[PDB]
Amino acid sequence: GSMSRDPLPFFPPLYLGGPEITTENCEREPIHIPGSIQPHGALLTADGHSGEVLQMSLNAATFLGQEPTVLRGQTLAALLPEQWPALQAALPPGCPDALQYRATLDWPAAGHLSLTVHRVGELLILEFEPTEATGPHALRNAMFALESAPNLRALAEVATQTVRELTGFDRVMLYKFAPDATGEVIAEARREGLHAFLGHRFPASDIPAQARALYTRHLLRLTADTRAAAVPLDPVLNPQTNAPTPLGGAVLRATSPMHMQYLRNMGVGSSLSVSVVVGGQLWGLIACHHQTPYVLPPDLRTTLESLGRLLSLQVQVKEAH
Amino acid sequence: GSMSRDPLPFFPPLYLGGPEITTENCEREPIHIPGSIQPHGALLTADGHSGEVLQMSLNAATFLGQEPTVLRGQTLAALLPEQWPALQAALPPGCPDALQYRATLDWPAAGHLSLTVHRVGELLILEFEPTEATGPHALRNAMFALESAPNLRALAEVATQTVRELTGFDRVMLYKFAPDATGEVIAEARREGLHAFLGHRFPASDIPAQARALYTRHLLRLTADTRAAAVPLDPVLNPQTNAPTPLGGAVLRATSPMHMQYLRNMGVGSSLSVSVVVGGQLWGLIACHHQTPYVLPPDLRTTLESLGRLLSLQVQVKEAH
Ligand SMILES: C=CC1=C(C)/C(=C/C2=[NH+]C(=C\c3[nH]c(/C=C4\NC(=O)[C@@H](C)\C4=C/C)c(C)c3CCC(=O)O)/C(CCC(=O)O)=C2C)NC1=O
Ligand SMILES: C=CC1=C(C)/C(=C/C2=[NH+]C(=C\c3[nH]c(/C=C4\NC(=O)[C@@H](C)\C4=C/C)c(C)c3CCC(=O)O)/C(CCC(=O)O)=C2C)NC1=O
Ligand SMILES: [Cl-]
Ligand SMILES: [Cl-]
């Protein structure tokens, strides 16, 4: 009912005995601490000073080639001797939780592993994703058509078409929030034949207050496969704190099951969105759908994040005119 | 004497019998058509429809492994069968002259060749640069400190420090133009011990009107080695037009000898700048120096171009506040 209102406090998650989430209580789902990840990658956590590996996703062996039990308790100084110093330097204590370190690692299988790391408090969160063998050059050519737009609607149209051209997604929308937190599709690029959502409005409840809050802090999130089961972290609690591990800054964070059902009800196989944040407030989303499961590659997600940040400034300039 | 005044018409270049350039006539130097390039890369031009190679820099054999005479008149369809279709698709007739196609080619020597192409009228201009084996990820982490700046001066300071950290340049300045076209160093990041230019002002003549005009169209230029002799194009005129080839959109464009002397007088071995363009007007430059010759890698130059575009929007937002 309002973009400026605080979200409600969260319930405990399910693995700490919290309540099942229904349409009556879903604003209280603790979406940032699901204790699990999407299965197209693996996640480890590690102490930010010692590098000791503290938690691992149960599927870690598939991606890393070693079982969860042997890797646990080993240090990153030993495991990643080539990356550990760089990672430390990049993510010092107290850095922003949205700051990332990225590297590409070689692995027995085809392509590489992409490694993305961020810091929350005293914890480092490491995401591993298979990638095949996008420059900053993409973003460069894409800024030109955005800078040439004559007004806010024209900017919206070209930004959505640009994102579609870059990603190949079946649908790319610009969804703009109103002050009552309802939202509206103001531009859409879509594959020929797909039903249009352009000009449609949706209730505030479709993107609940705690999601909107999270999306003001961590600007990109996705569901690669709307039918894929989440993979638990083990142990599920961070041993540093004996409390849940915040996963808001990890793209591999498991998506709310309530939203997964919403996406399936729409016939969506894969979803991704990027926040448009203007003057520190959530202005809208670049919201993308695919008809089938799709893993957008790491570097492309970063181009889209940067683009999201470009678009926010372009909007802020134009709204001031 | 004014940022809004038109530049004077240019003299013919030296190779068409134009006058020698002195401090009395230097606003008329045709800097965009020097008929030559910097020697750290090679350049070819080609017909935009047929792909026939029309001009080549005299050093082309060093980079391409084949002498200028045999490659001339061959088509890109034959020479670059893997890139020619993509290049065509990327740079259609009538596209912006600042739009670029980039690819990496393998060559007998160490590393690769970077290929950058743009279109001017019916001509494609191909630049080849050796590069060793930067993600969009650089630009991403760099936007954070810029978005956090509390005012225009703070933004200037962090942007210059960011560019220095990304590039390793000995000096990075933000130079801001006044309405009379004089300019002023408003932020500076520099190696310990180097003499400060912070807060210094310079006459309009140091960046003459035709340079300022060019820099409003083509947002990055450089001199990799301030003592290096230029390499002619052959033939020097575009056969399509029997007229000079515009090189404003090619980083390999030879720098004005007058500016090269200026840089040497400052003890500068390498220079690079990026335009900051606000509301279509040249607001300032991110101006970089190195004490010794330096070739900033292609992808890093693009990150800096994008950053330049980021900074311009951030300035435009703040000036509106
Ligand atoms: C064409 C119109 C259109 C709309 C309006 C739309 C909405 C949308 N919801 C999103 C997220 C969430 N929604 C809910 C919860 C509820 N949603 C409901 O309807 C009720 C039943 C409910 C609870 C009672 C939760 C917990 C999240 C957080 C998920 C997470 O990050 O873990 C996102 C962002 C993520 C993404 O891009 O995929 C989008 C873009 N997507 C469209 O295509
Ligand atoms: C610390 C202060 C400081 C200043 C003020 C500064 C100036 C500067 N001049 C630039 C360019 C040019 N200047 C001139 C000509 C003349 N210059 C003069 O003084 C008189 C003698 C003269 C003619 C009579 C021409 C033709 C060009 C175009 C070159 C080209 O693109 O081919 C550039 C951009 C290029 C770059 O980043 O390296 C910069 C940043 N660079 C600094 O570091
Ligand atoms: Cl979080
Ligand atoms: Cl030109």
XYZ file of C-alpha atoms and ligand atoms in Angstrom:
730
model
C 0.000 0.000 0.000
C 3.028 2.299 0.123
C 6.608 2.348 -1.184
C 7.859 4.343 1.822
C 6.420 2.088 4.548
C 8.755 -0.314 6.338
C 8.276 -4.013 5.595
C 6.903 -6.205 8.374
C 9.401 -8.193 10.489
C 10.042 -11.682 9.054
C 8.917 -15.041 10.420
C 11.518 -17.640 11.143
C 12.349 -19.724 8.077
C 10.905 -23.196 7.660
C 14.044 -24.968 8.865
C 13.777 -23.158 12.208
C 10.134 -24.163 12.638
C 8.569 -21.070 11.114
C 5.071 -21.092 9.628
C 4.116 -22.215 6.200
C 3.713 -19.306 3.848
C 0.267 -18.576 2.423
C -1.352 -15.645 0.653
C -2.329 -14.376 4.111
C 1.158 -14.076 5.592
C 3.487 -13.885 2.608
C 4.786 -10.382 3.388
C 6.575 -12.055 6.331
C 8.405 -14.759 4.385
C 12.149 -14.473 5.186
C 13.125 -14.639 1.489
C 16.717 -13.585 2.155
C 17.560 -16.654 4.307
C 16.164 -19.747 2.561
C 19.137 -21.891 3.572
C 19.330 -23.272 0.033
C 20.338 -22.454 -3.546
C 19.311 -23.063 -7.122
C 20.864 -26.247 -8.570
C 22.695 -24.765 -11.613
C 25.628 -23.770 -9.391
C 27.269 -24.454 -6.063
C 27.864 -22.261 -3.028
C 30.389 -22.284 -0.213
C 30.739 -19.916 2.690
C 34.001 -19.120 4.435
C 35.336 -17.184 7.376
C 36.358 -13.720 6.155
C 39.634 -13.689 8.000
C 40.882 -17.284 8.035
C 39.241 -18.471 4.815
C 38.013 -21.630 6.550
C 35.112 -23.203 4.557
C 32.091 -23.226 6.901
C 29.014 -24.167 4.805
C 28.575 -25.913 1.444
C 25.659 -26.661 -0.776
C 24.868 -30.371 -0.886
C 25.587 -30.527 -4.642
C 29.095 -29.101 -4.287
C 30.838 -32.303 -5.508
C 29.185 -32.054 -8.926
C 30.759 -28.676 -9.603
C 33.957 -28.829 -7.554
C 34.892 -32.496 -8.040
C 35.251 -33.132 -4.296
C 32.600 -34.196 -1.768
C 31.176 -31.739 0.827
C 32.706 -33.547 3.817
C 36.376 -33.284 2.766
C 36.226 -29.627 1.638
C 34.500 -28.447 4.790
C 36.945 -26.921 7.239
C 39.664 -26.537 4.639
C 40.877 -22.980 4.085
C 40.599 -21.041 0.853
C 44.345 -20.326 1.252
C 44.829 -24.032 0.568
C 41.934 -24.594 -1.847
C 42.303 -21.462 -3.980
C 45.884 -20.406 -3.443
C 45.822 -18.353 -6.659
C 42.615 -16.476 -5.825
C 42.623 -16.187 -2.023
C 44.925 -13.147 -1.803
C 43.072 -11.329 -4.577
C 39.741 -12.148 -3.008
C 40.870 -10.796 0.369
C 42.145 -7.597 -1.180
C 38.919 -7.074 -3.104
C 36.525 -7.631 -0.204
C 37.945 -6.075 2.984
C 35.989 -6.082 6.247
C 33.247 -3.471 6.174
C 33.007 -3.271 2.371
C 29.555 -2.979 0.794
C 27.702 -6.329 0.712
C 26.922 -5.691 -2.953
C 30.631 -5.407 -3.897
C 31.800 -8.515 -5.763
C 35.019 -10.316 -6.642
C 34.855 -12.393 -9.822
C 37.307 -14.869 -11.316
C 37.236 -17.722 -13.840
C 38.567 -21.112 -12.720
C 39.459 -24.136 -14.823
C 37.712 -27.441 -14.122
C 37.825 -31.018 -15.513
C 34.557 -30.473 -17.421
C 33.846 -28.355 -20.511
C 34.204 -24.587 -20.275
C 35.176 -23.048 -16.952
C 33.785 -22.266 -13.556
C 32.825 -18.686 -12.869
C 33.474 -17.680 -9.231
C 31.599 -14.738 -7.703
C 32.255 -13.686 -4.092
C 30.752 -11.095 -1.774
C 31.067 -10.317 1.961
C 28.342 -10.085 4.606
C 29.784 -9.133 7.980
C 32.563 -11.622 8.760
C 31.390 -14.143 6.139
C 32.494 -14.584 2.506
C 29.918 -16.138 0.186
C 31.324 -17.946 -2.872
C 29.184 -18.862 -5.873
C 30.471 -21.271 -8.547
C 28.806 -21.428 -11.953
C 29.715 -23.401 -15.082
C 30.275 -21.093 -18.085
C 31.294 -21.687 -21.727
C 34.289 -20.058 -23.393
C 30.494 -10.658 -23.366
C 32.894 -7.707 -23.366
C 32.289 -4.336 -21.765
C 31.808 -3.499 -25.435
C 28.179 -4.677 -25.335
C 27.221 -2.102 -22.701
C 29.048 0.589 -24.664
C 27.085 0.225 -27.899
C 23.882 -0.119 -25.884
C 24.212 3.251 -24.147
C 23.952 5.096 -27.484
C 20.315 4.264 -28.192
C 19.371 5.056 -24.611
C 21.057 8.471 -24.717
C 19.165 9.262 -27.937
C 15.653 8.687 -26.543
C 13.391 11.796 -26.656
C 11.325 11.152 -23.501
C 10.780 8.764 -20.599
C 8.477 6.428 -22.515
C 10.820 6.351 -25.514
C 13.707 5.604 -23.121
C 11.691 2.740 -21.629
C 10.932 1.286 -25.034
C 14.523 1.357 -26.260
C 15.926 0.009 -22.967
C 13.610 -3.010 -23.073
C 14.405 -3.711 -26.740
C 18.112 -3.337 -25.938
C 17.905 -5.821 -23.072
C 15.999 -8.250 -25.250
C 18.548 -7.985 -28.054
C 21.401 -8.553 -25.577
C 19.837 -11.515 -23.781
C 17.462 -13.254 -26.189
C 14.768 -13.400 -23.497
C 11.247 -14.077 -24.736
C 9.887 -11.100 -22.838
C 11.505 -7.989 -21.361
C 9.347 -5.457 -19.515
C 9.830 -2.171 -17.731
C 7.562 -2.276 -14.679
C 7.145 1.053 -12.882
C 6.005 1.292 -9.271
C 3.367 3.819 -8.228
C 3.442 5.440 -4.770
C 0.905 2.889 -3.499
C 3.317 0.121 -4.597
C 1.022 -1.108 -7.348
C 2.928 -1.351 -10.606
C 2.474 -1.025 -14.313
C 4.122 -2.374 -17.445
C 5.246 0.741 -19.298
C 7.346 -0.890 -22.042
C 7.682 -4.363 -23.402
C 9.826 -6.168 -25.937
C 8.573 -9.655 -26.690
C 8.817 -12.558 -29.135
C 6.251 -12.464 -31.940
C 3.008 -14.131 -30.887
C 3.376 -13.876 -27.116
C 0.483 -12.253 -25.260
C 1.195 -8.606 -24.437
C 1.401 -7.322 -20.849
C 2.053 -3.742 -22.042
C -0.101 -1.254 -20.143
C -1.273 -3.808 -17.573
C -1.333 -2.920 -13.865
C -0.753 -5.296 -10.914
C -1.402 -5.129 -7.181
C 1.282 -4.262 -4.665
C 1.021 -7.802 -3.265
C 2.630 -9.280 -6.373
C 6.035 -7.921 -5.221
C 5.662 -7.765 -1.430
C 7.333 -5.161 0.783
C 10.231 -7.286 1.953
C 11.043 -8.184 -1.658
C 10.947 -4.508 -2.616
C 13.270 -3.739 0.325
C 15.720 -6.462 -0.688
C 15.621 -5.231 -4.292
C 16.743 -1.793 -3.122
C 19.938 -3.380 -1.698
C 20.752 -6.179 -4.146
C 19.919 -5.157 -7.659
C 19.673 -8.421 -9.629
C 17.894 -11.720 -8.938
C 16.706 -14.642 -11.003
C 15.073 -18.030 -11.184
C 16.892 -20.106 -13.817
C 14.364 -22.953 -13.826
C 10.921 -22.439 -12.304
C 10.496 -26.166 -11.633
C 13.931 -26.856 -10.145
C 14.187 -27.983 -6.536
C 16.416 -26.032 -4.197
C 19.629 -27.532 -2.793
C 20.240 -27.073 0.966
C 23.307 -25.562 2.532
C 25.035 -27.743 5.100
C 25.142 -26.882 7.924
C 22.152 -24.608 7.332
C 23.190 -22.119 9.992
C 26.357 -20.011 9.849
C 28.609 -21.422 12.649
C 30.033 -17.938 13.280
C 26.667 -16.755 14.492
C 24.574 -19.897 14.980
C 22.073 -18.012 12.802
C 20.791 -18.054 9.216
C 23.177 -17.049 6.435
C 21.984 -13.947 4.528
C 21.822 -14.872 0.859
C 20.300 -11.694 -0.608
C 23.574 -10.879 -2.324
C 23.963 -14.296 -3.989
C 22.246 -14.860 -7.361
C 22.099 -18.565 -6.441
C 19.746 -17.785 -3.533
C 16.683 -20.057 -3.741
C 13.628 -18.131 -4.921
C 10.533 -17.896 -2.748
C 8.343 -20.906 -3.503
C 5.339 -18.544 -3.659
C 6.971 -16.606 -6.482
C 8.010 -19.825 -8.210
C 4.338 -20.825 -8.272
C 3.400 -17.391 -9.621
C 5.889 -17.804 -12.445
C 4.617 -21.270 -13.291
C 1.037 -19.912 -13.328
C 2.251 -17.445 -16.004
C 3.890 -20.203 -18.091
C 7.360 -18.824 -17.326
C 10.342 -21.199 -17.363
C 13.030 -18.692 -16.336
C 12.840 -15.204 -14.835
C 15.304 -12.425 -14.133
C 14.974 -8.848 -12.971
C 17.165 -5.824 -12.413
C 16.234 -2.981 -10.101
C 15.927 0.611 -11.292
C 16.771 2.663 -8.216
C 16.380 6.447 -8.383
C 17.412 8.677 -5.505
C 17.706 5.603 -3.315
C 14.117 4.499 -3.968
C 12.960 1.531 -5.991
C 11.516 3.125 -9.137
C 10.903 -0.025 -11.166
C 12.253 -3.298 -12.510
C 13.600 -4.510 -15.812
C 11.638 -7.790 -15.656
C 12.527 -10.650 -17.995
C 10.864 -13.994 -18.797
C 11.812 -17.007 -20.869
C 9.471 -19.792 -21.862
C 11.999 -22.464 -20.891
C 14.761 -22.759 -18.268
C 17.706 -20.494 -19.096
C 20.945 -19.614 -17.268
C 21.975 -16.119 -18.361
C 25.821 -16.121 -18.259
C 27.605 -14.287 -15.390
C 29.151 -11.526 -17.461
C 25.871 -10.823 -19.200
C 24.159 -10.439 -15.816
C 26.776 -7.841 -14.899
C 26.230 -5.959 -18.184
C 22.543 -5.920 -17.296
C 23.275 -4.674 -13.750
C 25.384 -1.858 -15.201
C 22.679 -1.152 -17.760
C 20.188 -1.041 -14.880
C 22.372 1.587 -13.265
C 22.633 3.507 -16.577
C 18.861 3.477 -16.997
C 18.296 4.750 -13.454
C 20.421 7.821 -14.099
C 18.783 8.456 -17.479
C 15.359 8.285 -15.781
C 16.517 10.603 -12.962
C 17.795 13.132 -15.522
C 14.558 13.059 -17.507
C 12.240 13.175 -14.512
C 14.097 16.345 -13.549
C 12.919 17.694 -16.932
C 36.812 32.364 -26.205
C 33.488 30.515 -26.189
C 32.244 26.918 -25.982
C 29.183 27.673 -28.135
C 31.019 29.323 -31.048
C 31.598 27.301 -34.211
C 35.188 26.275 -34.933
C 36.928 27.910 -37.885
C 36.992 26.005 -41.207
C 40.101 23.799 -41.539
C 43.115 24.289 -43.795
C 44.033 21.544 -46.175
C 46.285 18.945 -44.561
C 50.010 18.951 -45.219
C 49.855 16.192 -47.829
C 47.519 18.334 -49.947
C 49.848 21.336 -49.758
C 48.271 23.016 -46.753
C 50.202 25.418 -44.529
C 52.497 24.505 -41.733
C 50.796 24.793 -38.389
C 52.041 27.405 -35.927
C 50.691 28.982 -32.759
C 49.099 31.616 -35.007
C 46.935 29.307 -37.111
C 46.559 26.151 -35.047
C 42.772 26.426 -34.655
C 42.651 25.564 -38.384
C 44.706 22.369 -38.267
C 42.623 19.559 -39.851
C 43.331 17.168 -36.947
C 40.689 14.671 -38.061
C 42.391 13.874 -41.412
C 46.125 13.416 -40.767
C 46.412 10.608 -43.314
C 48.462 8.582 -40.831
C 48.277 6.514 -37.640
C 50.200 5.761 -34.486
C 52.656 2.858 -34.927
C 51.399 0.504 -32.154
C 48.679 -0.814 -34.476
C 47.668 -1.087 -38.101
C 44.712 0.306 -40.024
C 42.887 -0.733 -43.168
C 39.922 0.870 -44.839
C 37.357 -0.985 -46.913
C 34.327 -0.347 -49.056
C 31.228 -0.656 -46.856
C 29.290 -2.719 -49.332
C 31.835 -4.884 -51.153
C 34.427 -5.143 -48.381
C 37.215 -4.353 -50.850
C 40.358 -3.148 -48.971
C 41.061 0.396 -50.224
C 43.763 1.906 -47.952
C 46.354 0.384 -45.604
C 48.854 1.764 -43.188
C 52.420 1.259 -44.385
C 53.245 -0.930 -41.356
C 50.403 -3.368 -42.025
C 52.731 -6.348 -42.722
C 54.145 -6.235 -39.191
C 50.736 -6.825 -37.650
C 48.935 -8.794 -40.357
C 51.816 -10.924 -41.669
C 51.208 -9.910 -45.296
C 52.598 -6.930 -47.229
C 50.407 -3.897 -48.121
C 50.503 -4.557 -51.877
C 48.967 -8.061 -51.831
C 46.185 -7.265 -49.322
C 45.075 -4.139 -51.139
C 42.049 -4.781 -53.314
C 41.235 -8.058 -51.611
C 37.794 -8.233 -50.008
C 37.109 -8.708 -46.322
C 34.763 -11.552 -47.381
C 37.927 -13.385 -48.415
C 40.309 -12.045 -45.759
C 38.023 -12.264 -42.722
C 35.419 -14.804 -43.720
C 34.538 -15.424 -40.059
C 34.088 -11.748 -39.171
C 32.822 -10.124 -42.380
C 29.148 -11.082 -41.954
C 29.127 -10.053 -38.297
C 30.856 -6.801 -39.111
C 28.301 -5.988 -41.817
C 25.409 -6.730 -39.506
C 26.870 -4.572 -36.750
C 27.613 -1.507 -38.873
C 24.806 -0.958 -41.408
C 24.789 2.046 -43.741
C 23.749 5.180 -41.886
C 24.696 3.907 -38.417
C 26.361 6.328 -35.998
C 30.069 6.861 -36.790
C 30.836 6.242 -33.119
C 29.237 2.753 -33.168
C 31.904 0.035 -33.109
C 32.294 -3.646 -33.931
C 35.002 -5.434 -31.949
C 36.471 -8.911 -32.301
C 39.631 -10.750 -31.233
C 41.674 -12.485 -33.942
C 44.452 -15.035 -33.568
C 47.867 -14.263 -35.055
C 51.269 -16.024 -35.319
C 52.724 -13.817 -32.558
C 52.034 -13.807 -28.807
C 48.572 -12.861 -27.581
C 45.940 -11.877 -30.122
C 44.962 -9.062 -32.403
C 42.113 -6.856 -31.295
C 39.994 -5.631 -34.241
C 37.866 -2.492 -33.883
C 35.712 -1.269 -36.789
C 33.514 1.761 -37.363
C 31.711 3.244 -40.397
C 31.986 6.733 -41.888
C 29.641 7.152 -44.837
C 30.371 4.311 -47.270
C 33.749 3.484 -45.687
C 34.620 0.925 -42.985
C 37.693 1.723 -40.900
C 39.457 -1.283 -39.334
C 41.974 -0.939 -36.511
C 44.204 -3.872 -35.493
C 45.969 -3.868 -32.135
C 48.110 -6.526 -30.442
C 46.683 -7.516 -27.031
C 47.724 -10.053 -24.360
C 45.469 -12.806 -23.042
C 39.015 -6.638 -18.241
C 35.434 -7.796 -17.684
C 32.367 -5.590 -17.556
C 32.835 -6.407 -13.880
C 35.394 -3.604 -13.476
C 32.889 -0.920 -14.479
C 30.306 -2.461 -12.160
C 32.333 -2.195 -8.955
C 33.479 1.274 -10.001
C 29.971 2.730 -10.240
C 29.386 2.168 -6.506
C 31.867 4.756 -5.253
C 30.638 7.265 -7.811
C 26.996 6.820 -6.783
C 27.995 7.386 -3.143
C 29.640 10.798 -3.657
C 27.973 13.655 -1.693
C 28.581 16.515 -4.161
C 30.097 17.426 -7.521
C 33.617 17.914 -6.178
C 33.470 14.657 -4.213
C 32.222 12.913 -7.379
C 35.163 14.372 -9.306
C 37.652 13.198 -6.717
C 36.364 9.632 -6.575
C 36.037 9.344 -10.375
C 39.668 10.367 -10.888
C 40.905 7.980 -8.179
C 38.763 5.229 -9.718
C 40.226 5.805 -13.175
C 43.724 5.816 -11.747
C 43.140 2.566 -9.869
C 41.732 0.940 -13.027
C 44.480 2.104 -15.380
C 47.648 2.638 -13.346
C 48.223 6.004 -15.039
C 50.662 8.324 -13.291
C 48.182 11.180 -13.380
C 44.408 11.343 -13.841
C 42.670 14.727 -13.852
C 39.156 16.045 -14.209
C 39.414 19.202 -16.315
C 36.250 21.313 -16.424
C 35.573 23.832 -19.179
C 34.263 27.304 -18.362
C 31.912 29.140 -20.749
C 34.867 31.055 -22.217
C 36.498 27.682 -23.023
C 39.285 28.164 -20.503
C 39.538 25.127 -18.263
C 40.444 24.115 -14.768
C 41.727 21.012 -13.018
C 39.054 20.250 -10.434
C 40.281 16.829 -9.257
C 43.487 14.921 -9.567
C 44.790 11.492 -8.654
C 48.535 11.193 -9.076
C 51.581 9.099 -8.181
C 53.361 10.200 -5.005
C 55.919 12.905 -5.736
C 54.534 14.196 -9.027
C 53.894 17.938 -9.219
C 50.227 18.780 -8.650
C 48.075 20.453 -11.321
C 45.029 20.508 -9.001
C 43.313 23.898 -9.076
C 45.333 25.163 -12.046
C 43.605 26.992 -14.912
C 44.611 26.959 -18.610
C 43.752 29.083 -21.633
C 41.171 28.059 -24.197
C 43.958 27.762 -26.787
C 45.363 24.663 -25.098
C 42.410 22.617 -26.463
C 41.426 24.523 -29.616
C 37.869 24.782 -30.940
C 38.131 22.109 -33.598
C 39.516 19.669 -31.023
C 36.649 20.494 -28.669
C 34.195 19.923 -31.548
C 35.748 16.566 -32.422
C 35.694 15.569 -28.745
C 31.935 16.134 -28.673
C 31.537 13.474 -31.414
C 34.248 10.919 -30.627
C 34.667 10.526 -26.919
C 38.109 8.935 -26.455
C 41.536 9.733 -27.921
C 45.116 9.019 -26.984
C 48.789 9.310 -27.763
C 50.491 6.038 -26.789
C 54.040 7.336 -27.260
C 54.682 11.074 -27.463
C 57.896 10.566 -29.448
C 56.604 8.001 -31.945
C 56.500 8.897 -35.626
C 53.230 8.527 -37.475
C 52.754 5.869 -40.168
C 51.091 7.008 -43.432
C 48.043 5.468 -45.007
C 48.487 4.352 -48.597
C 46.946 5.669 -50.745
C 46.441 8.702 -48.508
C 43.139 9.652 -50.101
C 39.990 7.516 -49.966
C 39.482 6.279 -53.587
C 35.698 6.380 -53.107
C 35.813 10.133 -52.789
C 39.295 11.167 -53.931
C 39.337 13.016 -50.594
C 40.886 12.653 -47.133
C 39.730 9.780 -44.932
C 38.085 10.988 -41.688
C 39.932 9.355 -38.813
C 38.246 11.047 -35.836
C 36.585 7.784 -34.879
C 39.803 5.723 -34.913
C 41.932 5.661 -31.735
C 44.939 5.020 -34.002
C 44.511 8.466 -35.600
C 47.849 10.319 -35.522
C 47.830 13.063 -32.894
C 48.389 16.680 -33.871
C 52.130 17.334 -33.847
C 51.440 20.583 -31.951
C 49.817 18.629 -29.133
C 52.600 16.044 -29.205
C 55.068 18.872 -28.576
C 52.879 20.189 -25.754
C 52.910 16.774 -24.117
C 56.670 16.461 -24.443
C 57.062 19.945 -22.905
C 55.127 18.574 -19.889
C 57.348 15.468 -19.620
C 54.454 13.215 -20.657
C 55.216 9.903 -22.383
C 51.619 8.776 -22.982
C 48.298 10.621 -22.828
C 44.651 9.639 -22.974
C 41.405 11.494 -22.451
C 37.703 10.764 -22.297
C 35.042 13.378 -22.918
C 32.401 14.263 -20.338
C 29.448 15.415 -22.421
C 26.404 16.847 -20.635
C 23.269 17.811 -22.523
C 25.203 17.501 -25.762
C 27.883 19.986 -24.680
C 31.479 19.249 -23.807
C 31.573 19.707 -20.025
C 35.091 18.443 -19.364
C 37.682 15.730 -19.877
C 39.024 12.859 -17.842
C 42.656 13.602 -18.784
C 45.357 11.009 -18.136
C 49.171 11.087 -18.348
C 51.907 8.504 -18.010
C 55.584 9.260 -17.647
C 56.529 6.657 -20.254
C 54.886 5.252 -23.404
C 51.882 3.078 -22.548
C 49.233 1.301 -24.655
C 46.070 1.046 -22.556
C 44.378 -2.224 -23.674
C 41.261 -2.032 -25.914
C 38.767 -3.354 -23.397
C 40.047 -1.020 -20.716
C 39.555 1.945 -23.061
C 35.939 0.862 -23.508
C 35.433 0.579 -19.727
C 36.760 4.125 -19.503
C 34.423 5.316 -22.294
C 31.473 3.777 -20.446
C 32.720 5.285 -17.201
C 32.935 8.632 -19.008
C 29.296 8.215 -19.938
C 28.414 7.237 -16.333
C 30.186 10.305 -14.972
C 28.389 12.619 -17.401
C 24.997 11.473 -16.160
C 26.062 11.707 -12.510
C 27.239 15.292 -13.150
C 23.989 16.150 -14.984
C 21.943 14.789 -12.062
C 23.937 16.749 -9.491
C 24.042 19.994 -11.444
C 20.252 19.761 -11.496
C 20.505 19.818 -7.678
C 3.604 -9.179 -15.804
C 3.582 -8.824 -14.466
C 4.579 -9.380 -13.512
C 4.578 -9.118 -12.157
C 3.623 -8.266 -11.414
C 5.661 -9.819 -11.593
C 5.962 -9.846 -10.248
C 7.244 -10.214 -9.587
N 7.248 -10.760 -8.351
C 8.537 -10.882 -7.919
C 8.990 -11.391 -6.699
C 8.243 -11.945 -5.543
N 6.910 -12.147 -5.420
C 6.669 -12.700 -4.191
C 5.401 -13.109 -3.547
C 4.111 -13.072 -4.028
N 3.705 -12.809 -5.316
C 2.269 -12.896 -5.427
O 1.654 -12.706 -6.438
C 1.731 -13.302 -4.074
C 1.027 -14.608 -4.268
C 2.959 -13.442 -3.289
C 2.991 -13.738 -1.938
C 1.756 -13.894 -1.084
C 7.881 -12.895 -3.536
C 8.092 -13.485 -2.193
C 8.873 -12.413 -4.381
C 10.340 -12.480 -4.134
C 11.031 -13.601 -4.886
C 12.470 -13.771 -4.514
O 13.324 -12.901 -4.867
O 12.787 -14.780 -3.836
C 9.371 -10.396 -8.953
C 10.884 -10.318 -8.893
C 11.639 -11.562 -9.196
C 11.703 -11.905 -10.650
O 12.090 -11.038 -11.467
O 11.408 -13.076 -11.021
C 8.551 -9.976 -10.011
C 8.984 -9.309 -11.275
N 6.333 -10.424 -12.601
C 5.669 -10.223 -13.767
O 6.012 -10.691 -14.845
C 47.371 20.031 -17.073
C 46.719 20.701 -18.093
C 46.511 20.059 -19.418
C 45.924 20.690 -20.497
C 45.406 22.076 -20.546
C 45.908 19.771 -21.563
C 45.441 20.049 -22.830
C 45.026 19.100 -23.899
N 45.164 19.431 -25.203
C 44.596 18.458 -25.974
C 44.511 18.407 -27.368
C 45.004 19.348 -28.404
N 45.723 20.483 -28.237
C 45.974 21.019 -29.472
C 46.704 22.246 -29.862
C 47.360 23.173 -29.082
N 47.653 23.081 -27.741
C 48.380 24.245 -27.296
O 48.752 24.423 -26.171
C 48.601 25.132 -28.500
C 50.082 25.258 -28.671
C 47.980 24.351 -29.571
C 47.860 24.779 -30.880
C 48.302 26.141 -31.360
C 45.443 20.181 -30.446
C 45.500 20.363 -31.917
C 44.823 19.133 -29.778
C 44.180 17.949 -30.412
C 45.046 16.706 -30.394
C 44.470 15.565 -31.172
O 43.445 14.954 -30.739
O 45.020 15.257 -32.259
C 44.092 17.470 -25.095
C 43.353 16.217 -25.520
C 44.177 15.061 -25.962
C 44.833 14.311 -24.846
O 44.138 13.913 -23.884
O 46.069 14.054 -24.918
C 44.368 17.877 -23.781
C 43.944 17.196 -22.522
N 46.406 18.598 -21.107
C 46.832 18.758 -19.828
O 47.374 17.882 -19.167
Cl 20.378 -10.561 2.637
Cl 36.371 12.644 -38.233
